Amino acid sequence: KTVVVTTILESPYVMMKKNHEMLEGNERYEGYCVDLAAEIAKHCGFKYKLTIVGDGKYGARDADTKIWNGMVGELVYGKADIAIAPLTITLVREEVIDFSKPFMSLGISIMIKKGTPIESAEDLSKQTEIAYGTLDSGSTKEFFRRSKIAVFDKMWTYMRSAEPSVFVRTTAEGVARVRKSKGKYAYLLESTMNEYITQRKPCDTMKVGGNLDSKGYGIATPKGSSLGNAVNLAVLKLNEQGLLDKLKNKWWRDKGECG
């Protein structure tokens, strides 16, 4: 049986190939997670179909309906068999789906337009001229919502209250806002995405400050699925064999364009 893989368009994990409208099936896509999916499938002995998550989201539980959206929802409601994506391992997700051990480490970070007078989350929290926000329906937003650390709680209070919204639907939208705002908007995003984007033209953004936390992305399967065990062992093997580092350097180091 062909395994349905849910994933998300998020550079450099999964990207549409150039001129993709002429292409079909898995051949439409490239990136770190496209390469990782082929390795996991080989190691686990399955054929698979990559499917971009219908709503474009990572996955959160709606506070009002208690329904999961995003890739998490596609696993919970049976629409996909596995998620191979930069999906953060979190407590609320682990309650409803399973995760492999991490395939990549990360933490929350800050992107600014070059020259913006901000060095830290504390700097953001103590002023109002520069607006800032996060992605909807992901783990960064939930981090701020739940934090009891004074600086991050002050940031949450500001973000949830801002009108019009400072939250964006896609990472690309957040980055576009950093640029369009001439640096009057800063963006809170994971260090992995920040490190890729800041090294691609136009070379006008930068990462500032230390990471705010330390966590990992995992391969997710529906709770109790027969694939979970083999997928976890495959992640560990690929790490130990050096393959995850090679893919990281293919999609980050080797893609740099900013000198």
The two tokens of residue 34 are 């496209």
Rounded CA gap, 48 and 50, in Å? 7
Length, in residues, of the chain: 259
Task: Indicate the residue among 43 and 176 with the shorter CB distance to ligand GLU.
Answer: 176
Placement of tokens 């399967």 in the chain: 221
Residues 224 and 127: their CA atoms lie apart, in Å, by 47
Q: Which is nearer to ligand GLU, 46 or 167 (CB)?
A: 167
CB-nearer residue toward ligand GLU: 189 or 247 = 189
Among residues 58 and 185, whose Cβ is nearest to ligand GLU? 58
- 3-class DSSP assignment, residue 132: strand
Taking the C-alpha atoms of residue 9 and residue 248, their distance in angstroms, rounded to an integer, is 17
Provide CB contacts within 8 A for 59, sequence distance 6+.
68, 69, 70, 71, 72, 73, 87, 93, 137, 138
With beta carbons less than 8 A apart as the criterion, state whether 103 and 36 touch.
yes
> Residues comprising the binding site for L-glutamate?
86, 88, 93, 139-140, 190
Applying CB under 6 A, the residues found at the interface with ligand GLU are 58, 86-88, 135, 138-140, 189-190
Contact 184, 128 (CB under 8 A): no
CA distance 189 to 166: 13
Name residues whose C-beta falls within 8 Å of residue 123's C-beta, 6 or more positions apart in sequence: 117
And the tokens for 244? 């995850």
Helix (H, G, I), strand (E, B) or coil at 135: strand
Residue nearest ligand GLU, Cβ-based? 138
* Closer residue to ligand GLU, CB minimum distance, 135 or 166: 135
* Nearest to ligand GLU of 58, 152 (CB atom): 58
